[PDB]
Design an enzyme around this catalytic site. Structure first.
Site, PDB file in Angstrom:
ATOM      1  CG  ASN A  20     135.405 -57.697  20.582  1.00 47.26           C
ATOM      2  OD1 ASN A  20     136.637 -57.992  20.552  1.00 47.26           O
ATOM      3  ND2 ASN A  20     134.634 -57.433  19.526  1.00 47.26           N
ATOM      4  CB  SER A  61     136.348 -60.180  17.386  1.00 45.94           C
ATOM      5  OG  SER A  61     135.796 -59.040  17.164  1.00 45.94           O
ATOM      6  CD  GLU A  82     127.486 -50.558  21.330  1.00 48.65           C
ATOM      7  OE1 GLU A  82     127.533 -51.783  20.900  1.00 48.65           O
ATOM      8  OE2 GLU A  82     127.664 -49.614  21.072  1.00 48.65           O
ATOM      9  CG  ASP A 108     131.003 -56.834  19.196  1.00 46.42           C
ATOM     10  OD1 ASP A 108     132.069 -56.644  19.914  1.00 46.42           O
ATOM     11  OD2 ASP A 108     130.607 -56.138  18.239  1.00 46.42           O
ATOM     12  CG  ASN A 167     132.588 -57.619  14.893  1.00 50.22           C
ATOM     13  OD1 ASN A 167     131.721 -56.614  14.399  1.00 50.22           O
ATOM     14  ND2 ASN A 167     132.827 -57.585  16.066  1.00 50.22           N
ATOM     15  CG  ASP A 169     138.137 -58.556  15.134  1.00 44.78           C
ATOM     16  OD1 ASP A 169     136.690 -58.673  14.578  1.00 44.78           O
ATOM     17  OD2 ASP A 169     138.211 -57.788  16.268  1.00 44.78           O
TER      18      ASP A 169
END
Length: 130
Positions: free
Chosen positions: A60, A51, A35, A53, A46, A49
């Protein structure tokens, strides 16, 4: 901060992650590795959307933490996303524990499903004395 393999392993064990909800420490390690590469400052935006991480576990901003920049944010961890970018991962772990209490559990992360699930993950804790 970028944790060294065994250093992180020991930290996670100390924070009670070994066996948390039936998931072994090696599986949590495998998640952190794919990750963020054990980097607490990692962030992934991202554009789809809108959003982001955050941190070592790539949590998120749409569902778990608040960063004030993502539409439809729920903030289920009741935590500012900036707390997930600290060298001390205590806050991040407390939120992670909440994240996996949802139906999908650790299967929420696609990278974990693709690189950890059903595979030999003993390598991630080998030689760490944990």
């Amino acid at each position: 901060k970028v944790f060294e393999r065994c250093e992180l392993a020991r930290t996670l064990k100390r924070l009670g992650m070994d066996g948390y909800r039936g998931i072994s420490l090696a599986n949590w390690m495998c998640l952190a590795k794919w990750e963020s590469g054990y980097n607490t400052r990692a962030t992934n935006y991202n554009a789809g959307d809108r959003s982001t991480d955050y941190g070592i576990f790539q949590i998120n901003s749409r569902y778990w933490c608040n960063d004030g920049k993502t539409p439809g944010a729920v903030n289920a961890c009741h935590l500012s996303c900036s707390a997930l970018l600290q060298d001390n991962i205590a806050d991040a772990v407390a939120c992670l524990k909440r994240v996996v209490r949802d139906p999908q559990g650790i299967r929420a992360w696609v990278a974990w499903r693709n690189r950890c699930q059903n595979r030999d993950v003993r390598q991630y804790v080998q030689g760490c004395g944990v």
